[PDB]
Design a protein around this ligand. Structure first.
Ligand SMILES: OC[C@H]1O[C@@](CO)(O[C@H]2O[C@H](CO)[C@@H](O)[C@H](O)[C@H]2O)[C@@H](O)[C@@H]1O
Ligand code: FAR
Ligand code: ZN
Lengths: 410, 4, 315
């Protein structure tokens, strides 16, 4: 076959050029923008090929580590726009470090715990910063961050009694949840609530009454799920919807056939990455929101006894996604990004790596099959498809909280 | 890209 | 009055009309994490916002302060919530506030808080008279803005403004037939007005979609809409569609057409079609062509479909 120092790539096959956009000689803003991206991506792909010599791809772990380590402590005023999302920054950075198997010093871990405690609201839940009103987004992030740290100190920071009361204070009669008091409603809330409620063992029989049905109403003609009933299928909202249903054990409420066909169609034939909506551009962060749906669908179908499911691969091109992330989404100075030409940020660093991990690791029952493209060191730690934190962290947290009673309920 |  | 970038802007700590209240610093703890190095102007405004919030001061000065807090970080939902509390407490002119949010959304159209604020104002006023036009302006700048389309669907459904939306949809499809957001709006309008059970409407839609496919054969949105309006009843329930697609295949063997054929065969086999063995063989042949040549990015999906078909219809 091939010597160990050369690894043929899917994106470099001669026939891959046939995957370039065919605009039928009818130009619109959509095709013009798509063609511009493909042109740049082809240039990038070609820079990794030296005729028959194709060096193994490398995840710049050390560069990413230094970028993350610095951000966990300090951020430039360029992040003032995220002053109401500090727990998100904690989660994005800690999860990235977790995926890279970079240890978190005990002192830094305690400091994160203390900071998130300051973000916790007396009414329950966490806000975007100290003194801010609680909101389900930073609440979801804070809980995930605390679970990644996984110490009893971290677990006990969460005021479970008030958290459950807070969730009740956001619950609507139609099954949906507000993101915060007097705030907006969309499927993100159902997932944020289901995620934190299941991890901390505070689910009551009535908490999610009608929620599964509301989420199902969000699935549209495309097969994917929109933010609210009637809206366009979107990768981020679809991940929220399916993940929430998996937690509620109500995945069957959806048409899984149309959902599967929709998400698989979101992988770009030329770029290898995923787009968030049909006819929109590729973006590294959808490596998680979209690809993450495949392990969820695998689990859902496996629970139904689907005799046709693979026992070694997810139903998306795992190699092509790794090729897109490794060749197109890494910032040479550390951090990951949307696509070539875009600047790095902690959000894309988190989700590009999360998607890379999903693409590298397949697991079902007693079957495990890894596909780590490039040098062996590229292998990342696995991530749980529902919560997007390490599976070990999910088990440790759920076990810990299951030892506590549901707040004021039997 | 904004999540919230 | 004065804006954050205005030459005469003065920090709140230097304003005489604010001297009577002490600012409240943000407590990040002794050993801060994800600490943002705020500009002096940013910290100044928020130190005073924290002060009025803590004292729950429902005043005109607090109201004006939120405007600056919003300019500094329009994503701060706490500031927006407090601003709404003030709008009510101070009985502020909501039409004036509508003019304000209009300007703010134009500046930051992908922000969740600004669109929700606008919705609240429309709900309080029960006045949607400016909505369709405003949203149209936003969509003229970004025809796929998710928040804009979502707000548009809410306004139309809540105030029953369906009368001219299909015309709007047709206009945008003419501009960019690949705009998936518009195809979604098309389904939204039809399903909520005439519905798709009216066979005259369904035929009109199938004809229109097929015409769009002929014009731009590789536009996935049209193909997805065609499947979308026929899938619930079952693709196998439309025998003439299969024949028409089979005729265009030799000249338009795109992955979209081939995949649609497999979708039809899947449903046919699910409904005890005649010549079952022949149909299964044809479907498996196409799955292989898709996996190996025409749609290789989805090789695993097509292999799965092939195995699925065999698990359900081999006999
Ligand atoms: O993907 C289609 C699939 O979604 C469901 C919801 O689970 O319905 C959605 O799509 C229909 C069009 O096919 C719409 O009429 C409906 O409003 C929307 O929620 C399933 O019923 C359907 O099989
Ligand atoms: C460019 C990326 C964007 C706009 C983000 C899309 C993703 C979502 C919306 C999903 C949000 C999920 C949670 C808050 C848990
Ligand atoms: Zn992105």
């Amino acid at each position: 076959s091939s010597p160990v120092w050369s690894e043929p790539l899917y994106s470099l096959r001669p026939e891959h050029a046939r995957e370039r956009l065919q605009d039928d000689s009818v130009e619109t803003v959509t095709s013009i923008e798509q063609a511009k991206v493909e042109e740049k991506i082809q240039e990038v792909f070609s820079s990794y090929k030296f005729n028959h010599l194709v060096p193994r791809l490398v995840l710049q772990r050390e560069k990413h580590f230094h970028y993350l380590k610095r951000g966990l402590r300090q951020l430039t005023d360029a992040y003032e726009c995220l002053d109401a999302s500090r727990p998100w920054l904690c989660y994005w950075i800690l999860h990235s470090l977790e995926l890279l198997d970079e240890p978190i010093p005990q002192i830094v871990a305690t400091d994160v715990c203390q900071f998130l405690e300051l973000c916790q609201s007396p009414e329950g839940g966490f806000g975007g910063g100290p003194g801010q009103y609680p909101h389900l987004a930073p609440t979801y992030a804070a809980v995930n961050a605390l679970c990644i740290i996984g110490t009893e100190e971290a677990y006990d920071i969460i005021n479970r009694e008030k958290l459950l009361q807070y969730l009740y204070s956001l619950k609507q009669p139609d099954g949906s949840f507000l993101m915060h008091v007097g705030g907006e409603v969309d499927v993100r809330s159902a997932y944020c609530a289901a995620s934190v409620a299941s991890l901390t063992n505070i689910i009551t029989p009535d908490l999610f009454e009608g929620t599964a049905e509301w989420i199902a109403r969000c699935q549209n003609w495309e097969g994917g799920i929109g933010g609210v009933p009637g809206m366009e299928a979107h990768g981020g909202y679809t991940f929220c919807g399916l993940a929430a249903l998996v937690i509620l054990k109500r995945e069957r409420s959806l048409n899984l056939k149309s959902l599967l066909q929709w998400v698989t169609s979101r992988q770009m034939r030329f770029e290898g990455g995923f787009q968030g909506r049909c006819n929109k551009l590729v973006d590294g962060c959808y490596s998680f929101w979209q690809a993450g749906l495949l392990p969820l669908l695998h689990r859902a179908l496996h629970a139904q006894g689907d005799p046709a499911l693979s026992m070694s691969h997810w139903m998306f091109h795992q190699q092509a996604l790794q090729e897109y992330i490794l060749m197109c989404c890494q910032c040479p100075a550390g951090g990951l990004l949307d696509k070539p030409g875009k600047s790095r940020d902690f959000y894309h660093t988190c989700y590009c790596l999360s998607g890379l991990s999903i693409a590298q690791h397949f697991g079902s029952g007693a079957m495990l099959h890894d596909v780590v493209l490039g040098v062996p060191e590229n292998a990342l730690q696995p991530t749980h498809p529902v919560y997007n934190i390490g599976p070990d962290k999910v088990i440790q947290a759920t076990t810990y909280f299951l030892q506590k009673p549901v707040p004021g309920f039997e | 890209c904004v999540l919230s | 009055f004065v804006s954050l970038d205005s030459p005469s802007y003065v920090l709140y700590r230097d304003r005489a009309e604010w001297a009577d209240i002490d600012p409240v610093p943000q407590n990040d703890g002794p050993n801060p994490v994800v600490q943002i190095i705020y500009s002096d102007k940013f910290r100044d405004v928020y130190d005073y916002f924290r002060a009025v919030l803590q004292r729950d001061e429902r005043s005109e000065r607090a109201f004006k302060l939120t405007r600056d807090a919003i300019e500094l970080n329009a994503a701060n939902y706490t500031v927006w919530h407090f601003r709404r509390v003030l709008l009510k407490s101070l009985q502020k002119d909501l039409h004036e506030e509508m003019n304000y949010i209009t300007a703010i959304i134009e500046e930051q159209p992908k922000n969740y808080q600004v669109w929700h604020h606008r919705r609240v104002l429309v709900e309080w006023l029960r006045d949607p008279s400016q909505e369709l036009e405003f949203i149209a302006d936003i969509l003229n700048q970004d025809a796929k803005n998710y928040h804009a389309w979502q707000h548009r669907q809410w306004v139309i459904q809540e105030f029953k403004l369906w009368d001219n939306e299909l015309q709007y949809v047709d206009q945008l499809l003419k501009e960019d037939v690949r705009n998936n957001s518009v195809w979604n709006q098309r389904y939204f309008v039809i399903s909520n007005t005439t519905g798709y059970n009216d066979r005259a409407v369904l035929e009109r839609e199938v004809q229109y979609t097929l015409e769009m496919i002929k014009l731009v054969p590789h536009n996935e949105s049209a193909w997805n809409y065609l499947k979308g309006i026929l899938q619930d009843r079952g693709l196998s329930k439309y025998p003439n569609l299969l024949n028409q697609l089979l005729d265009l295949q030799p000249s338009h063997s795109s992955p979209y057409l081939i995949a649609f054929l497999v979708d039809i065969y899947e449903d046919m086999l699910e409904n005890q079609c005649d010549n079952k063995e022949d149909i299964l063989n044809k479907a498996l042949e196409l799955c292989e062509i898709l996996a190996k040549e025409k749609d290789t990015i989805r090789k695993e999906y097509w292999r799965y479909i092939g195995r699925s078909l065999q698990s359900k219809h081999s006999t």
